[PDB]
């Protein structure tokens, strides 16, 4: 049996709402965790864009013009794939920032709903605590009136033995006046318990719904943040496959690089002559 | 076909075949330098990228999270520093390859300068003796022309002239003929000395060409290997990163949403029973 929020965050203290305060603090801790995940993506995207842009500049500004044939094509193949890798990491930064934007939208979505429950809970809890203070004030008054009624009845019983008719009439109207005061204090006390009980069940119902809603928010936040870590690790691991495939293109170009072919291609293109100069002989002026 | 067989000049005073090969070595030296600059700038970029990844991992937050999701987020920061540290090590590996290429480059330049000194020596002597031999030819021809003019002058007056005036003109013709004969010997010896250096140069040119072909074969081999090694080291970095990111996925597989919620409840629960309702308390009961 999976334990729920609504069943494990109550307080035996009637005037305490610690169970709600603990859950509300957990949502604030999760909100900061969502921001920390967003902060890592933003800084990683900035680093990836800067790294990609630097690779593009190195490839475009690099030399190699003096080389010819295979070695030139191989070196140009490395510069071409370097720009492709750098441009891919620039696109990775845009992908990470899209994950950054999605989390901030989800984060602000939960805050909008959380504020609604906060207003509802703060209302019913304030009314519950207010009526509780009223009920206890009614109880203290009700109990004091009962003591006054018993004291007024004991005073009547005391003087109704050998006392005069004038002093007895005064004491009997005092006992009836105090007995009526105790009856009205009981009705006010009974009505205070009735109003307090009404709000109590309302609060218990409202607290039970808020707990299930906060559990739904936490379940969604934990799921999306777990998915964000899995997607982020996949997008970085996918970048390793894309880069490795691009660097393989350089090796494919190098397979067509023959040392003997480049030397023969340079000879056939820059050869000046296949015969050494003829020796200078003696030239007779008359022969 | 080889360098020694395809870089001659029929022009005796021209050494273009040697100049073309020497220019090819200078172009190959710049190609080696351009490969060094690519490694130097890539290593600088990797060190900057690696150091930045480490700073992001160390400065990142996540303290408010607990249980699996915290361990997963801490696993991402841990592997991020490992990736950044690995890219820092990649820069040292690239710079070591950079140092190897510049060392190889200066080895060839030292040997190339030696052959340049030898060729510049024998070529300067070959051109020097050729210029001397042609100066000897011009003198020899001028002496022959002077000798023919002195003999034709004798033939002119040797018809009805006196014995004294004929002897005077014939002694001039013999004086000019002797000058042409000794000028011919100087011209002959100039051809002998020139031929000596010529054969010396042809052998020296053949040795220098064969050496330059070996240097290009070595340079093309090391640069071809340097490109293959560079592509492997970059591809190896992709494998190391994927293995590190794999550690994050393995941690995420042990991340259960329901486990984190139940673990939070068992640690922060305040009570399992709602407060008791406040009842009416009779003063007499």
């Amino acid at each position: 049996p999976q334990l729920q929020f609504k069943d494990a965050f109550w307080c035996r203290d009637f005037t305490a709402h610690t169970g709600y305060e603990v859950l509300l603090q957990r949502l604030l801790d999760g909100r900061k965790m969502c921001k920390d995940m967003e902060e890592l993506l933003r800084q990683r995207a900035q680093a990836e864009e800067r790294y990609g842009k630097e690779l593009v500049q190195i490839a475009r500004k690099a030399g190699g013009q003096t080389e010819i044939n295979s070695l030139r094509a191989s070196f140009d193949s490395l510069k071409q794939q370097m720009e492709n890798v750098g441009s891919s990491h620039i696109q990775l930064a845009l992908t990470l920032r899209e994950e950054l934007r999605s989390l901030e939208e989800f984060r602000e979505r939960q805050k909008e709903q959380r504020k609604k429950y906060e207003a509802v809970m703060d209302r019913v809890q304030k009314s519950k605590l207010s009526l509780y203070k009223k009920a206890m004030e009614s109880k203290k008054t009700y109990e004091q009136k009962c003591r006054d009624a018993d004291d007024a009845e004991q005073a009547f019983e005391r003087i109704s033995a050998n006392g005069h008719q004038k002093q007895v009439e005064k004491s009997q109207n005092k006992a009836r006046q105090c007995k009526d005061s105790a009856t009205e204090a009981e009705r006010v006390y009974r009505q205070s318990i009735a109003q307090l009980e009404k709000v109590r069940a309302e609060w218990e119902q409202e607290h039970r719904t808020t707990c299930e809603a906060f559990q739904l928010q936490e379940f969604d936040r934990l799921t999306i943040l777990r998915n964000a870590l899995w997607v982020h690790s996949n997008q970085l691991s996918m970048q390793c496959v894309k880069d490795d495939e691009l660097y393989e293109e350089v090796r494919l170009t190098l397979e067509g690089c023959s040392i003997d072919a480049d030397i023969d291609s340079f000879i056939q293109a820059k050869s000046t002559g296949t015969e050494p100069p003829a020796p200078v002989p003696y030239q007779n002026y008359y022969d | 076909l080889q360098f020694k067989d395809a870089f001659w000049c029929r022009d005796f005073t021209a050494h273009t075949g040697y100049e073309v090969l020497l220019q090819r070595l200078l172009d190959g030296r710049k190609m080696c330098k351009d490969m060094e600059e690519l490694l130097r700038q890539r290593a600088q970029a990797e060190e900057r990228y690696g150091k930045e990844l480490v700073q992001i991992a160390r400065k990142a937050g996540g303290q408010t999270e607990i249980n699996s999701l915290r361990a997963s987020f801490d696993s991402l920061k841990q592997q991020m520093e490992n990736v950044g540290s690995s890219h820092i090590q990649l820069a040292l590996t690239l710079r070591e390859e950079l140092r190897s290429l510049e060392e190889f480059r200066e080895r060839q330049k030292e040997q190339r300068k030696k052959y340049e000194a030898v060729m510049d020596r024998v070529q300067k002597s070959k051109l020097s003796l050729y210029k001397k031999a042609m100066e000897s030819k011009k003198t020899y021809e001028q002496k022959c022309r002077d000798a023919d003019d002195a003999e034709q002058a004798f033939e002119r007056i040797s018809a009805n002239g006196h014995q004294k005036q004929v002897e005077k003109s014939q002694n001039k013709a013999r004086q000019c003929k002797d000058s042409a004969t000794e000028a011919e010997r100087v011209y002959r010896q100039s051809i002998a000395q020139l031929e000596k250096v010529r054969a010396e140069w042809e052998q020296e040119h053949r040795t220098t060409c064969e050496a330059f072909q070996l240097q290009e074969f070595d340079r093309l081999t090391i640069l071809r290997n340097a490109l293959w090694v560079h592509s492997n080291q970059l591809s190896m970095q992709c494998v190391k990163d994927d293995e590190l990111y794999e550690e994050v996925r393995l941690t995420l597989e042990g991340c259960s949403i329901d486990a984190d919620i139940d673990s939070f409840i068992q640690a922060k629960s305040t009570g399992t029973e709602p407060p008791a309702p406040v009842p009416y308390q009779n003063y007499y009961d």
Binding site: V241, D243, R251 | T221, N232, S235, M236
Partner: peptide, 14 residues
Amino acid sequence: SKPKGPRNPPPTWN
């Protein structure tokens, strides 16, 4: 999913 990685040079080299 997983990178191919480095590869030995052609065996006809060197």
